[PDB]
Amino acid sequence: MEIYCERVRDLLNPKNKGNLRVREHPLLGPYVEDLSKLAVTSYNDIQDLMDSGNKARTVAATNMNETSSRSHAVFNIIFTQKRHDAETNITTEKVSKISLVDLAGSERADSTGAKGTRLKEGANINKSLTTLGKVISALAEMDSGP
Amino acid sequence: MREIVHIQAGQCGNQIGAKFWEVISDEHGIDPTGSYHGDSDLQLERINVYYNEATGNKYVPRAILVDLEPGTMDSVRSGPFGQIFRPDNFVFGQSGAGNNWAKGHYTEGAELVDSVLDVVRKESESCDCLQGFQLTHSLGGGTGSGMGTLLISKIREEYPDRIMNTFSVMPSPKVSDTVVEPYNATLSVHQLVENTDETYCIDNEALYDICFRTLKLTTPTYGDLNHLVSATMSGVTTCLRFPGQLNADLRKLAVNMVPFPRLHFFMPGFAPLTSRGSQQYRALTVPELTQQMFDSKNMMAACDPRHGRYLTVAAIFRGRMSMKEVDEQMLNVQNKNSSYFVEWIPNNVKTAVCDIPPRGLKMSATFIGNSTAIQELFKRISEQFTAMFRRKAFLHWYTGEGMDEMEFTEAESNMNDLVSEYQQYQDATADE
Amino acid sequence: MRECISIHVGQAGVQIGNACWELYCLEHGIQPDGQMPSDKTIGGGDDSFNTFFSETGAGKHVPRAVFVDLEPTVIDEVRTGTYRQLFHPEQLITGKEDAANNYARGHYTIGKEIIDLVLDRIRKLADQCTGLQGFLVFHSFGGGTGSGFTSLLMERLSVDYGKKSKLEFSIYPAPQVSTAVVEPYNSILTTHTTLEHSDCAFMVDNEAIYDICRRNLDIERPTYTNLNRLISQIVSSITASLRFDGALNVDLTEFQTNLVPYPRIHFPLATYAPVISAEKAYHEQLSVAEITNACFEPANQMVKCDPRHGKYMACCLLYRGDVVPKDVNAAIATIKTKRSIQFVDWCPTGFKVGINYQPPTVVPGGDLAKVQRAVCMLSNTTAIAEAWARLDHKFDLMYAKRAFVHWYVGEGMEEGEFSEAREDMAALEKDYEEVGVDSV
Numbered sequence A: 001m002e003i004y005c006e007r008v009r010d011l012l013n014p015k016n017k018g019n020l021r022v023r024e025h026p027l028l029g030p031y032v033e034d035l036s037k038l039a040v041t042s043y044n045d046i047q048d049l050m051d052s053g054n055k056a057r058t059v060a061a062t063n064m065n066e067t068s069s070r071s072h073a074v075f076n077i078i079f080t081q082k083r084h085d086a087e088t089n090i091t092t093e094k095v096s097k098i099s100l101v102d103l104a105g106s107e108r109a110d111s112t113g114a115k116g117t118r119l120k121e122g123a124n125i126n127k128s129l130t131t132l133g134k135v136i137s138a139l140a141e142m143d144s145g146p
Numbered sequence B: 001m002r003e004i005v006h007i008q009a010g011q012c013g014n015q016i017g018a019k020f021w022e023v024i025s026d027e028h029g030i031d032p033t034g035s036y037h038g039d040s041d042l043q044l045e046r047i048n049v050y051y052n053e054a055t056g057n058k059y060v061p062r063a064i065l066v067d068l069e070p071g072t073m074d075s076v077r078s079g080p081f082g083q084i085f086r087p088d089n090f091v092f093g094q095s096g097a098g099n100n101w102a103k104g105h106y107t108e109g110a111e112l113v114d115s116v117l118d119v120v121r122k123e124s125e126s127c128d129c130l131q132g133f134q135l136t137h138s139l140g141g142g143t144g145s146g147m148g149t150l151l152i153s154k155i156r157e158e159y160p161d162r163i164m165n166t167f168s169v170m171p172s173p174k175v176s177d178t179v180v181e182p183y184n185a186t187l188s189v190h191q192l193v194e195n196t197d198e199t200y201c202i203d204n205e206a207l208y209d210i211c212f213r214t215l216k217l218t219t220p221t222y223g224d225l226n227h228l229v230s231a232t233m234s235g236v237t238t239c240l241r242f243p244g245q246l247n248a249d250l251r252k253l254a255v256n257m258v259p260f261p262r263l264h265f266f267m268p269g270f271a272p273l274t275s276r277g278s279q280q281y282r283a284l285t286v287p288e289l290t291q292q293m294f295d296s297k298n299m300m301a302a303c304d305p306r307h308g309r310y311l312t313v314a315a316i317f318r319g320r321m322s323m324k325e326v327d328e329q330m331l332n333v334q335n336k337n338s339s340y341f342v343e344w345i346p347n348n349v350k351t352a353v354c355d356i357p358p359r360g361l362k363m364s365a366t367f368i369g370n371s372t373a374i375q376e377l378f379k380r381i382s383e384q385f386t387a388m389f390r391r392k393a394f395l396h397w398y399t400g401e402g403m404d405e406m407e408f409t410e411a412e413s414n415m416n417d418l419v420s421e422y423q424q425y426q427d428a429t430a431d432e
Numbered sequence C: 001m002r003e004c005i006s007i008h009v010g011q012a013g014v015q016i017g018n019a020c021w022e023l024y025c026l027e028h029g030i031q032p033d034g035q036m037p038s039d040k041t042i043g044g045g046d047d048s049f050n051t052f053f054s055e056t057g058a059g060k061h062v063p064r065a066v067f068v069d070l071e072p073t074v075i076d077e078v079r080t081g082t083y084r085q086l087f088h089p090e091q092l093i094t095g096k097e098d099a100a101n102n103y104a105r106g107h108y109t110i111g112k113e114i115i116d117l118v119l120d121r122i123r124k125l126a127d128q129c130t131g132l133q134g135f136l137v138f139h140s141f142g143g144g145t146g147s148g149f150t151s152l153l154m155e156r157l158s159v160d161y162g163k164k165s166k167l168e169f170s171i172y173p174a175p176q177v178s179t180a181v182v183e184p185y186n187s188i189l190t191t192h193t194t195l196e197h198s199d200c201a202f203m204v205d206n207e208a209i210y211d212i213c214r215r216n217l218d219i220e221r222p223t224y225t226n227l228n229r230l231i232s233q234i235v236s237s238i239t240a241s242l243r244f245d246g247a248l249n250v251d252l253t254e255f256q257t258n259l260v261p262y263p264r265i266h267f268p269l270a271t272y273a274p275v276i277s278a279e280k281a282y283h284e285q286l287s288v289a290e291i292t293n294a295c296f297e298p299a300n301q302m303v304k305c306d307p308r309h310g311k312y313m314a315c316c317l318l319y320r321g322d323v324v325p326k327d328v329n330a331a332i333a334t335i336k337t338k339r340s341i342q343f344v345d346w347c348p349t350g351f352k353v354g355i356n357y358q359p360p361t362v363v364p365g366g367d368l369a370k371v372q373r374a375v376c377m378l379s380n381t382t383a384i385a386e387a388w389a390r391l392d393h394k395f396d397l398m399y400a401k402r403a404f405v406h407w408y409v410g411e412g413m414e415e416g417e418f419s420e421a422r423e424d425m426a427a428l429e430k431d432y433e434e435v436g437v438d439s440v
């Protein structure tokens, strides 16, 4: 999934003009509703899915980088272990989540030659990054204190 | 130029808007037919903020009326100012919401929202440089909450840059008129906290208290409450329309008021108030207005500001007055009640002054306060919400219209998080 | 020919410009419509002086000024006011909303789209000039437009014209009274352009002038009009040497030669000595010694800072009216004798003196009395820092929690740009604490 400007967009799902809603399960916490969750059985499948996702990502050029990113990106892998000793053990014992996050780089505006739509994208990116910095500092202070 | 678009939804919003239009028109001098009959030349200088031209030297307000019951539309048309509005802007349906948030938000409102949005696009396209929107509605009701929230969401989606305001009447603590107020109020606040840019919290109990204690009326009706609210609404946006020594756009108020994005709930106030037959005793001046303005009895939010701290505050004066007196009075108020002001904002009073006072008021002042004590209001609703959600008192009416318990749970959690944020600053100490 | 260009930015600048141009039109005998009937009665002279007014074919005089703002109200008061026929119709309004006390809006998003028109108008005015001497920019810290657009305009002017002088008059935030909760952010951000590109910046505070009006002039409820009239008197006294004859004359280059010992120390204070009501105008001689002693009184400073806590590094005195050099020499000797006024060891001379014959004028409906002698002092002291220190404290108290920062970030500003400016400010203050240490 990608976060472009406070909207979640799916990448493996083909061209879909609509956005995806964010809802909080009372027990499992935040999540995104109707994310195209795809299974895999061969390395070729995940490789092709990764290629398609990188292709469909929104990317624009600027003075700092010919191919910069205009959106935060999140890659998630859900992995299940099934122990099937029929005499003793049970299946679906362990479920694990692996998350890999690529964040957009802070924009300095005047140094990047941003203008028009690029400037608004930079502003939204900076707002998100500042919020991230505030939580990080707060959470660090909180765990350090207690 | 700064054009505002005005929307009204539900019985409460429509009646408030009718009274408000009957006021602004006098301030600018417009006859009920539409023609202009005034005396000063400043009245037409900025009339385009609210009104559009029409060929016969006529003025039509830039308003939109919304409901799902023809009764309120009929009442508004069959009235003193019914002929001032454009007929095409009367959008309505039949088989109203019936005090059900689900019917307003999902089932019935979803049909009429497209027509309402078409009218809104047509009205906004003609504006030269649109400033923002404003919408009047009641949270405890049906039609108002659902359709207002849906329209706010859609308009924010389409016009992300402009300002959105709201003058919402919240459920009162004790004077109640609907049995399922908490569900609608919670579900509405869950979206208001996210989408809009400012919100002014009105409560009927506070208005009745002002009417009976200050104005000394004997049989207040909803007309007087609409009067007070209209006075405040007109006073907030004066600096767009008349010249002054210190202007204050809506965006400037937004920047100076809210310190963080989620804390955009305000308590409004207006001064003076002599109750008549006692105007000859009170000497009207700047310190008298400041004394009446910061008093607790005057507040319209039905919440005591002494139980928290003022995150910040803004005062808009209208009259011909000296700047030193204003600055000295605001400094004195800040220094005297030093406990009730947050300590990590060195100066937390925004000031504006305009030269043209109301028709017959040598002076006037409007007050917009942002204080932690507002959390009390939300807590009340939350408590009542739990008392009816633990046993699912009236839930099936909502679930029959396409909802689920998860929606209620996330709304309750979001409002509780709001209460926790406001409570984070309320206590003293904190400091550096 | 001696010529200057005035730029007024923001509401404060425009109002100060109204008061200023009222005074200038009164001084040279120009009616509000631009006509000058006295030429028909006098029959000669260049009394329609080129320092501020340009003369067309039909005898009309048009001032050399540029007004700028991002909202239409304040200038629309002038487009339909008493002076509607004086100015050129090109007044450069932005037909949109205002910066809303946001530096980023006034420097990045909304501040542009009107900068090019301003530069074109200034180009036309400078090209029409012949011997341009300097720019006089009026603005105010704490406002979105007056900070951001002033920064952008000053940067462009420094890039474009380069070697011309650029003075600056500004309304600095007061220690206690204020009218906005985000003033410190705007002032600290504005520090860069006034530090790097400006050539000499004068500071003014509202609290100081309120006190002066209360005590000297006996006005209990003053408004902004009195403030602007006093500032206009100061600016006129500064610029008078370019216009009228005098025994000792001082150009703008003289100010920039005698008041700035080093490039980064160009922030002097200004005072005007004979401020007195008509009722108290009697009972007092108002001689040269009295008015020049009144300048050093700490209570008459135009900024709420105590000069006694620092050291005087330079002083310019500008006299108007019936003044003789013997008296000013005696006054300078007397001031040098006193001990409360401390001069740095590396400036044995200290004083520069200028004298002009034209006495100050009186506006109808004013508050200042008619006087025969007037003085304006421009003093470069090390007390200023103190005021800066106070403002810095406020900034820190709001930046520890990142309050109001998202408004700035959402309009193109980056967060780190805050911190840099603060550090820059700290650097200037330290260089105003070493330039005064006694030599060893």
Ligand SMILES: CC(=O)O[C@H]1C(=O)[C@@]2(C)[C@H]([C@H](OC(=O)c3ccccc3)[C@]3(O)C[C@H](OC(=O)[C@H](O)[C@@H](NC(=O)c4ccccc4)c4ccccc4)C(C)=C1C3(C)C)[C@]1(OC(C)=O)CO[C@@H]1C[C@@H]2O
Binding pocket: B022, B023, B024, B026, B027, B215, B223, B224, B225, B227, B228, B230, B231, B234, B235, B271, B272, B273, B274, B275, B276, B279, B358, B359, B360, B361
């Ligand atoms: C005769 C006189 O001047 O007496 C005052 C008066 O006694 C007081 C009590 C008035 C009076 O207001 C009320 O009694 C009242 C009743 C219900 C709800 C709200 C108010 C007054 O009715 C209200 C009236 O206010 C106005 O006319 C304003 O110009 C105001 N009017 C409207 O809101 C309005 C309503 C319908 C149609 C057109 C205008 C206004 C403000 C901004 C822009 C335009 C108009 C005034 C000064 C007075 C009376 C008549 C007693 C007050 O109201 C206003 C808005 O001024 C109440 O607090 C103020 C203080 C005044 O001293």
Ligand SMILES: Nc1nc2c(ncn2[C@@H]2O[C@H](COP(=O)(O)OP(=O)(O)OP(=O)(O)O)[C@@H](O)[C@H]2O)c(=O)[nH]1
Binding pocket: B245, C009, C010, C011, C012, C013, C015, C016, C070, C071, C098, C099, C100, C101, C102, C139, C140, C141, C142, C143, C144, C145, C146, C171, C178, C179, C206, C224, C225, C227, C228
């Ligand atoms: N001396 C003096 N100061 C003024 C006057 N008017 C406003 N100010 C000062 O200006 C500050 C407010 O910022 P402004 O100068 O008004 O900024 P602005 O020109 O309105 O720019 P925007 O905020 O974008 O509209 C206040 O702190 C006032 O003290 C004036 O007439 N005289």
Ligand SMILES: Nc1nc2c(ncn2[C@@H]2O[C@H](COP(=O)(O)OP(=O)(O)O)[C@@H](O)[C@H]2O)c(=O)[nH]1
Binding pocket: B009, B010, B011, B012, B013, B015, B016, B097, B099, B138, B140, B141, B142, B143, B144, B145, B169, B176, B177, B178, B204, B222, B223, B225, B226
């Ligand atoms: N201030 C004010 N409140 C009103 C008025 N009319 C109704 N109300 C309040 O509105 C609430 C009911 O909301 P309602 O208008 O029925 O919502 P709707 O059915 O969706 O339009 C009640 O709690 C009333 O107190 C009015 O004229 N003025």
Ligand SMILES: [Mg+2]
Binding pocket: B247, C010, C011, C071, C098
């Ligand atoms: Mg302004």
